């Protein structure tokens, strides 16, 4: 351990060695002088103890250091434990070709691409660029190629583009529980310092785009590239190895776009007329039709594989909407028309892609998936969904329900003070009454946040589904759920935070109005418990995975 120079400050591994050496030396020198039996016995006992402590200082050793009371590193602790030789000889050693760049998003990439910064390159594919320059004659020697790479001329970037043309690369994230955490991609040079990533494969790495550090490994040999192309390539593993279900399914934005582009209204702009089917896209970029125009007739060519999987065409002039008609062009031929003529939620496109992979194949499925992602991003950008303070409304009968509940609680406590009801019975009855009140408030919230959008017509009332952004982003399945929306308008609930004990008075506020200090303070305990539980469960899950893998 070479220090500043004054004191060497050795690694305390030869200290036990020099101790044993000098102890044995003085013992051998004393043996030649015929020492008394007690002295030589004590000296040999000390030598035995020193030799026994040299091998391991964790058994009656209690060895200290010159600086502090640190245990001396023996020849048995550096071979076991979390930090040791068996965790440096197994897969615990650091490897070159690191990566370590922030992950961003990219909507122009495909299922088997990744944005690789030009600055991260020229350092990873360095021996490859050297060989390329040596074979192209522009590099007479190795020192010349190194000098040309150090100066970063114009030619080395073209040589790099030529080399990285069809050379597969692989990506890896630090937390990798399942095998999907390590996939392969075709690297594409992009100016910048961050690594782009496909939005559909993000779910595979379980990221949330708050970019952490990543890892980019480069296969050198030919067989490694073959394995990364045929086994580790993202276009090969589409289903999950745990239940055989597709995981490349679209996400919130794509789901939201596909749900907004597939929605029927009552009286749209220029509805009723008959359309050819490929003409709906023309009136979209103009003013002759709306995407949400219902009761529209447009023929479509449905291809079936009845006769030994041969494509047979059939036309029936089905009634649909402009949006679904436009989306049908994205839909391949080997799919029917009864799969897009619906609300098209989150599970809808999931089972659509599942049936597509089951019937039509892998490559057409990947094509359909990327096209779906493209059109979903496009329609979600064209829509312009936003969340405001008016997008949520408190039920008008909420104050009355709360007054009735508090009057019932007052009657219950009056009966308790009268001597007819005990403490536990009154407590449980108050809990049940508050639960019933919360359930009724939650039910009344849906009365205003669902099918409560009346539009003028011949009958002046039709009661169609609402177009609230909060409800459209929830019901579709993009992001959030009904329980979370309940806290936005209704009441949060009992919130039994301390040790699971339920409080008699529940929080009767919502995240839109102004909560009280005490209510927020009470609610804070649940989040503190939840965060600690989430922080603690990770270690247990890791230990369980480690043990199961080591056993099986």
């Amino acid at each position: 351990v070479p220090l500043d120079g004054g004191r060497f400050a050795t690694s305390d591994l030869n200290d036990l060695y020099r101790r044993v050496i000098n102890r044995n030396n003085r013992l051998k020198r004393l043996l030649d002088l015929a020492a008394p039996d007690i002295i030589v016995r004590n000296e040999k006992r000390m030598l035995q103890e020193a030799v026994d402590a040299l091998l391991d200082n964790g058994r009656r050793g209690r060895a200290i250091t010159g600086s502090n009371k640190r245990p001396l590193k023996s020849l048995a602790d550096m071979i076991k434990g979390k930090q040791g030789r068996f965790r440096q000889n197994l897969l615990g050693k650091r490897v070159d070709y690191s990566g370590r760049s922030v992950i961003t998003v990219g909507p122009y990439l495909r299922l088997h691409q990744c944005g690789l910064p030009k600055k991260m390159a020229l350092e990873l594919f360095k021996p490859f660029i050297y060989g390329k320059l040596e074979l192209r004659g522009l590099a007479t020697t190795i020192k010349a190629a190194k000098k040309m790479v150090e100066r970063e001329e114009a030619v080395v970037w073209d040589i790099l583009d030529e080399v990285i043309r069809e050379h597969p690369v692989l990506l890896n994230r630090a937390p990798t529980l399942h095998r999907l955490g390590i996939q392969a991609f075709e690297p594409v040079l992009i100016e910048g310092k961050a690594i782009q990533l496909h939005p559909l494969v993000c779910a595979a790495y379980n990221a949330d785009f708050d970019g952490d550090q990543m890892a980019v490994h480069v296969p050198l040999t030919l067989e490694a590239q073959l394995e990364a192309r045929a086994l580790m390539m993202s276009t090969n593993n589409i289903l999950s190895p745990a239940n055989g279900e597709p995981i490349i399914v679209p996400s919130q934005d794509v789901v939201l776009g596909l749900y907004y582009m597939t929605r029927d209204c009552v009286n749209a702009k220029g509805e009723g007329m008959v359309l050819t089917g490929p003409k709906e896209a023309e009136r979209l970029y103009r003013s002759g039709l709306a995407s949400l125009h219902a009761r529209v007739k447009v023929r479509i060519t449905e291809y079936e594989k009845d006769a030994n999987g041969e494509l047979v065409a059939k036309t029936s002039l089905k009634d649909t909407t402009v949006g679904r008609a436009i989306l049908w062009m994205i839909v391949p031929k080997g799919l029917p028309y009864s799969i897009v003529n619906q609300a098209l939620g989150k599970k809808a496109i999931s089972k659509m892609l599942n049936t597509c992979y089951r019937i039509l194949g892998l490559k057409p499925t990947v094509i359909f998936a990327d096209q779906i992602m493209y059109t979903g991003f496009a329609y979600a950008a064209r829509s312009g969904a936003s969340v405001g303070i008016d997008d949520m409304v408190i039920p008008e009968k909420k104050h009355e329900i709360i007054s009735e509940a508090e009057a019932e609680v007052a009657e219950i406590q009056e009966q308790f003070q009268s001597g007819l009801v005990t403490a536990g019975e009154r407590y449980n009855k108050v809990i049940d009454i508050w639960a019933a009140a919360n359930d009724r408030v939650s039910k009344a919230m849906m009365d205003n946040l669902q099918t409560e959008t009346v539009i003028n017509r011949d009958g002046q009332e039709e009661k169609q589904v609402s177009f609230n952004s909060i409800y459209m982003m929830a019901d579709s399945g993009a992001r959030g759920s009904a329980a979370q929306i309940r806290q936005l308008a209704g009441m949060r609930g009992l919130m039994a935070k301390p040790d699971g004990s339920i409080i008699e008075t529940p929080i009767t506020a919502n995240f839109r109005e102004g909560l009280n200090v005490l209510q927020y303070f009470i609610s804070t305990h649940g989040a503190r418990k939840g965060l600690a539980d989430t922080a603690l469960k990770t270690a247990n899950s890791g230990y369980l995975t480690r043990r199961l893998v080591d056993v099986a």
Binding site: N89, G92, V549
Partner: protein, 1341 residues
């Protein structure tokens, strides 16, 4: 009315629905309030430095007739100030000198003193002084010692329910921990066996410790057990009956109460019969004989005639013994109760297991048990047991343990001794047994009444006491050997151990760490944190789960919001804005006194315990005009559970709504509209807000931002504010008025700004002025604005126009789309002043002199260096170039002809030195601000130091000149006023003073005298200034003290500048974080009819899943404020009249309920109105309290006022296609904060570098070229794929194999693309390490 003319430039529109009674404290008096008593001279030796001397200083020699007395101590003046200690690199401390006394007594004479040596003061080390605000200066750095939370010393009763044997029982134990000494526990066994476990040792036997205190068996039996009555005469067996004690389920037989039988034999028990027997007089009644077999004897009884050992103690009586105890004559044999309900035999059940019965045989068993190797010799068995926890020198509780002990046992007296007594343990065990029986409640562990905070005030004292008790031993051993001799007081008192202990405590410890200088909020948060880790408290970080949780007592003493989300969650806490330390060390909180239904303006600081006795209301309760309540049933807390109470039962009330909020979580707008998790993460990310070039005011506002900024100790204030005369980019002078100044001073104040100085995280600390010229400044007003500040308020980030909408999937999940107009406008641009330094390291063969003419280097590369070899300040050093030339003198050779010829050919190069300069780290660039240089005093160098020297000196020259300059004028003025009507002209005296022409017949009396007097004064002043600066020069050129080998260092400060990029991570106050995804041009950004494209685009999918309505409200308020500011800017640009503008401002200010009053035209002089309107022409700031912010109706009204849609949404167009969005999108200006984690600071890649000597592996961290660990989770993914070949090439070839990586490199350069496995080096290292023991292992075939 309004005040603070400095603050009166930009008045913030605060709402404040609830009034304010208690003003916000200094908010940073905890570290300085506890450290002040450590140095302040106290009248009595109770606490501080006096308590460290008066405790254990008067030590006495071993009968050597010597005494050590203490008179007083004093702290000397520091050598340097706060500024020079950080520049040079030396610690900031003050020398300690104390006057001692050596009293020697002559032998063979009682109280006979011959002489004393109490005439010399000894210096004992330098104590590190404290800076102006909580911080310390050590080795040029700035560290902070966080206060630690510890359980108060005292008696605690744990429960451990359902964790003993999984049978359903509980073992009520008891513990007593002192402040300094050994511990003591009393464990309970399911078999009703007590333990005396001490210091977590093995399970001790039963209560033998009481027997070792001279208490025999009969004494303990009479103490813990009570004998009611017993009598036997002529086989009558008559005993008194008590209804309270002698009871049970049923009775066997023979139960008569003075004739008539109340409870028949074999009958059910009735309370009426018991009441009738207790009411009537009942004497001793007869009892059967079968009860004698069950009851146990209490005391030892013997026969009158025979004195044998029959009828011993702790032995149940039998029938066979009855006869032998009937003829003996023992008529009264007291017994026990033995009731399984209340009075259990637990004490007697454990006494029968004691191996010894006598005190002598008992005190020797604990000696061989506490110490493993020790024989019983009757020498140390008593001393060690008395010195373990009964001696003052080894046991103490600082009266806090005594207070908690007297409070837990219902004792009234609070004064006691530090050592423990017998009755103390007696009462502890009695209360433990009572709690076990069911008398008393179990104490709470995580309760704040049991916890207390320790700052440096009571930690440096303990450190000094530990350092002094070591020198006490040396003093004792030196006063015994050679006492009868005259010597100096500083004979053996060397302050080496004390200094070493102080340095180990302050410099490098577990509580002393570098402060966070990222932002003014970061440091003020770090100074107010509370940790539980360190030398005490729990055992380690993996201690428990129920401790790291919020408690109902955490209402107004700590912050349940601010806490990390890592492995130490819950352990770290934050103090509230109204929290305060108690005298003992507890936490107090203020509450208003509510009497007879009205609220009194008086406040009281209630503690954790006292708060549980009274009824405390809420701050969110309505208040009448006369201090009454609107609703009779107000929500109040009584014992933790809040409920409705009447207006007469209310005792106390909260102060404000932000009492449960800390100093950082209170800067979040609409906190109640945010989830407890998002607000938490937003307050956590707010600590790391990186400053920018121009801090933009938080138009939204959250509250006491000005207060936080002025109390963060980052800006400059104006003490004794008078009139300003000279302003500059680094210097500001202020002329104090005649009222706020004292005589004997010139009357000027000087402030030297801090421009571009490094911090603990390479963040530049720049300052900016605020006044232009001749502006009246009051006392306490902010003069200079530092980093992240604006006109005195806090500004961590910048205002940005946002729009929640999807945009081509660039804001897909949490990515923040940023326009190109944000990089162009130089927004979010940060400076980074990193600075490396090259040493000298003078060897023994030669002194490597830093030259400017090194070998193996072209003249072009040496064109940036100086004549002494040092990079010119201002040079744009980039890449890797020479920064500080320095050649090491390599041991030259002898003859060797070639050298001789070579040497002559060139000269002063061949066989001379080995070039090794600084060289800017491969990956660093930027102009070099300035270079510092320290040289060992006495070295004939100072080449480029001279230039620097002059600069420093020059600054000081003028610094003290101005003050003197003004003084001179007065002198002449006085002389000119004294020369009035003394035969002197105007121009004559104006042309040249010359001491008023040597008093040329001014009055020929007092005139000359006055002149003479003035002359002396004038001359005196001259000499005064001369020596004043004389000392200054000395200190400046006093030299520097480096290490041993080092000769002369030269630190160079670089200075980069980063704009934003698609890899930067920004966040907001609400918790919405994310990285950039693309920098799109201005045209692609959405817009509307008017224009002004948005700069930032966010994703609205987070709002439903993450309750963040607070950010929507912030956006709306920012939009309204910007609308009002744009209207004001338009009115100013149209050059409208002042009356219309003032009316508009008054109308925009006075909108709302009767919550605040503010009117113009009453104090302003028509000139300050334009100044106010000019500061907020780009938008006026608002202010909304933490839990008392504005309402939706007020926001909608403020939106309608600004001539815009009341809803808030607006129809935006498309910047790419050119069409219009059918759905309206919310717009507005929110606040964004830059973070520290960037992409140009962590990104690194490599293919081949340097590996270690062990197993030949590369480096892991961010070295010059390092890799990343390929863990088991990665290979487990690859084994289920078929990457066996990839695994084979990644495990040996590119990681461990030495020849393998080289052959792979060769094959890739050639273009072969093959692999040879070979064998890694880690397996060989493993085999070599295994062969080192008595184990054989070798590879076979």
């Amino acid at each position: 009315m309004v005040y603070s003319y400095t603050e009166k430039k930009r008045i913030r529109k605060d709402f404040g629905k609830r009034p304010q009674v208690l003003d916000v404290p200094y908010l940073l008096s905890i570290q300085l309030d506890s450290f002040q008593k450590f140095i302040e001279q106290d009248p009595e030796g109770q606490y501080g430095l006096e308590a460290a001397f008066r405790s254990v200083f008067p030590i006495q020699s071993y009968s050597g007739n010597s005494e050590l007395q203490y008179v007083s101590y004093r702290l000397g003046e520091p050598v340097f100030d706060v500024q020079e200690c950080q520049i040079r690199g030396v610690t900031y401390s003050a020398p300690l000198r104390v006057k001692l006394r050596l009293v020697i007594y002559e032998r063979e004479a009682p109280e006979g003193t011959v002489k004393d040596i109490k005439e010399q003061e000894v210096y004992m080390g330098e104590i590190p002084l404290m800076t102006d605000n909580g911080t310390f200066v050590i080795n040029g750095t700035e560290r902070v010692i966080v206060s630690q939370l510890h359980r108060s010393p005292g008696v605690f009763f744990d429960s451990d329910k359902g964790k003993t044997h999984s049978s359903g029982k509980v073992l009520y134990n008891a513990r007593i921990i002192p402040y300094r000494g050994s511990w003591l526990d009393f464990e309970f066994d399911p078999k009703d066996n007590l333990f005396v476990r001490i210091d977590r040792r093995r399970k001790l036997p039963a209560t033998i410790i009481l027997r070792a205190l001279n208490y025999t068996t009969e004494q303990i039996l009479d103490l813990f057990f009570e004998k009611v009555i017993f009598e036997i005469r002529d086989n009558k067996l008559q005993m008194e009956l008590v209804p309270e004690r002698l009871r049970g389920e049923t009775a066997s037989f023979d139960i008569e109460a003075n004739g008539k039988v109340y409870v028949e034999k074999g009958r059910r028990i009735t309370a009426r019969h018991i009441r009738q027997l207790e009411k009537d007089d009942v004497k001793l009644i007869e009892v059967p004989v079968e009860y004698i077999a069950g009851k146990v004897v209490a005391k030892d009884y013997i026969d009158e005639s025979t004195g044998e050992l029959i009828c011993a103690a702790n032995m149940e009586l039998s029938l066979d013994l009855l006869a032998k105890l009937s003829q003996s004559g023992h008529k009264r044999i007291e017994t026990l109760f033995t009731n399984d309900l209340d009075h259990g035999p637990y004490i007697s059940e454990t006494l029968r297991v004691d191996p010894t019965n006598d005190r002598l045989s008992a005190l020797v068993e604990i000696y061989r048990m506490m110490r493993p190797g020790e024989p019983p010799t009757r020498e140390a068995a008593e001393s060690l047991f008395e010195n373990l926890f009964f001696s003052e020198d080894r046991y103490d509780l600082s009266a806090v343990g005594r207070m908690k002990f007297n409070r837990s046992l219902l004792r009234e007296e609070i004064e006691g001794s530090g050592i423990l007594s017998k009755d103390d343990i007696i009462d502890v065990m009695k209360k433990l047994i009572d709690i076990r029986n069911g008398k008393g409640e179990v104490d709470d562990i995580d309760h704040l009444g049991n916890r207390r905070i320790r700052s440096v005030g009571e930690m440096a004292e303990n450190q000094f006491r530990v350092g002094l008790v070591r020198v006490e031993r040396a003093v004792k051993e030196r006063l015994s050997l050679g006492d009868l001799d005259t010597l100096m007081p500083q004979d053996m008192i060397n302050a080496k151990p004390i200094s070493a202990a102080v340095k180990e405590f302050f410099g490098s410890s577990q509580l002393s760490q570098f402060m966070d200088q990222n932002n003014p909020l970061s440091e003020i948060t770090h100074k107010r944190r509370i940790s539980a880790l360190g030398p005490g408290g729990l055992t380690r970080e993996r201690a428990g789960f129920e401790v790291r949780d919020v408690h109902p007592t955490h209402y107004g003493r700590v912050c349940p919001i601010e806490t990390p989300e890592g492995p130490n969650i819950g352990l770290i806490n934050s103090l509230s804005v109204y929290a305060q330390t108690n005298e003992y060390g507890f936490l107090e909180t203020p509450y208003r006194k509510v009497t007879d239904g009205v609220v009194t303006d008086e406040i009281h600081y209630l503690s954790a315990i006292e708060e549980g006795n009274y009824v405390i209301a809420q701050a969110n309760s309505n208040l009448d005009e006369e201090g009454h309540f609107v609703e009779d049933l107000v929500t109040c807390r009584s014992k933790g559970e809040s409920s409705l109470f009447s207006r007469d039962q209310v005792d106390y009330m909260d102060v404000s709504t932000q009492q449960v909020v800390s100093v950082g979580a209170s800067l979040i707008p609409f906190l109640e509209h945010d989830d407890a998790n998002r607000a938490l993460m937003g307050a956590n990310m707010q600590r790391q807000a990186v400053p920018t070039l121009r801090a933009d005011k938080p138009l939204v506002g959250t509250g006491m931002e000005r207060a936080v900024a002025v109390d963060s100790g980052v800006t400059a204030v104006a003490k004794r504010g008078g009139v300003v005369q000279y302003v500059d980019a680094s210097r500001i002078v202020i002329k104090v008025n005649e009222d706020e100044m004292y005589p004997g001073e010139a009357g000027i104040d000087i402030y030297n700004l801090t421009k571009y100085t490094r911090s603990n995280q390479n963040t530049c600390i720049n300052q900016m002025p605020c006044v232009s010229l001749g502006e009246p400044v009051e006392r306490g007003d902010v003069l200079a604005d530092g980093p992240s500040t604006d006109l005195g308020e806090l500004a961590l980030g910048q205002n940005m126009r946002v729009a929640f909408m999807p945009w081509n999937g660039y804001n897909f999940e949490d990515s923040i789309l940023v326009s190109e107009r944000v990089v162009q406008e130089d927004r979010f641009t940060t400076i980074h002043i990193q600075e490396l330094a090259c040493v000298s390291r003078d060897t023994k063969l030669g002194p490597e002199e830093i030259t400017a003419d090194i070998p193996n280097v072209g003249e072009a590369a040496l064109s940036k260096l100086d004549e002494s070899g040092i990079v010119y300040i201002g040079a744009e050093v980039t890449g890797g170039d020479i920064l500080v030339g320095k050649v090491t003198p390599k041991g030259e050779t002898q003859l060797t002809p070639e050298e001789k010829l070579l040497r002559a050919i060139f000269g002063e190069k061949a066989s001379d030195v080995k070039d090794s300069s600084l060289r800017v780290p491969n990956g660093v660039s930027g102009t070099v601000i300035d270079v510092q240089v320290f040289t060992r005093d006495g070295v004939e160098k100072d080449k480029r130091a001279l230039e620097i020297e002059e600069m420093q000196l020059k600054q000081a020259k003028k610094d003290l000149s101005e003050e003197l300059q003004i003084l001179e004028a007065g002198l002449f003025s006085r002389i000119r006023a004294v020369l009035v009507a003394g035969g002197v002209e105007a121009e004559k005296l104006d042309k040249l003073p010359r001491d008023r022409w040597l008093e040329l017949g001014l009055t020929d009396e007092e005139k000359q005298n006055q002149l003479e007097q003035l002359a002396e004064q004038y001359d005196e002043l001259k000499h005064e200034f001369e020596k004043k600066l004389e000392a200054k020069r000395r200190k400046i050129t006093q030299g520097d003290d480096l290490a041993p080998g080092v000769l002369k260092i030269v630190k160079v400060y670089l200075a980069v500048k980063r704009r934003i990029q698609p890899g930067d991570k920004m966040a907001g106050r609400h918790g919405n974080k994310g990285v950039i995804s693309k920098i799109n041009p201005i045209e692609d950004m959405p817009y509307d009819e008017n224009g002004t494209p948005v700069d930032i685009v966010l994703n609205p999918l987070g709002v439903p899943s993450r309750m963040n309505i607070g950010q929507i409200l912030e956006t709306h308020l920012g939009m309204a404020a910007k609308g009002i500011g744009d209207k004001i800017n338009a009115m100013l640009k149209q050059q409208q009249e002042v009356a219309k503008l003032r009316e508009f401002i008054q109308r925009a200010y006075d909108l709302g309920a009767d919550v605040r009053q503010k009117v113009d035209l009453s104090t302003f002089s028509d000139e300050e109105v334009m100044r106010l309107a000019e500061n907020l022409r780009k938008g006026m700031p608002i202010a909304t309290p933490v839990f008392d912010g504005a309402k939706e109706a007020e926001i909608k009204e403020l939106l309608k006022l600004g001539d815009l849609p009341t809803s808030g949404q607006i129809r935006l167009y498309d910047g790419r296609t050119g069409e219009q969005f059918e759905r309206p999108v919310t717009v507005g200006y929110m606040y964004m904060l830059k973070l520290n984690h960037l992409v140009d600071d962590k990104m690194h890649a490599r293919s081949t570098g340097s590996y270690s000597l062990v197993t030949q592996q590369p480096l892991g961290g961010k070295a010059q070229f390092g890799g990343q660990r390929f863990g088991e989770m990665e290979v487990w993914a690859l084994e289920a794929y078929g990457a066996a070949y990839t695994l084979q090439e990644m495990l040996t070839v590119k990681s461990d194999d030495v020849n393998g990586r080289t052959k792979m490199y060769k094959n890739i350069v050639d273009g072969n693309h093959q692999m040879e496995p070979g064998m890694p080096e880690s397996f060989n290292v493993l085999l070599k390490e295994i062969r080192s023991l008595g184990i054989n292992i070798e590879l076979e075939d």
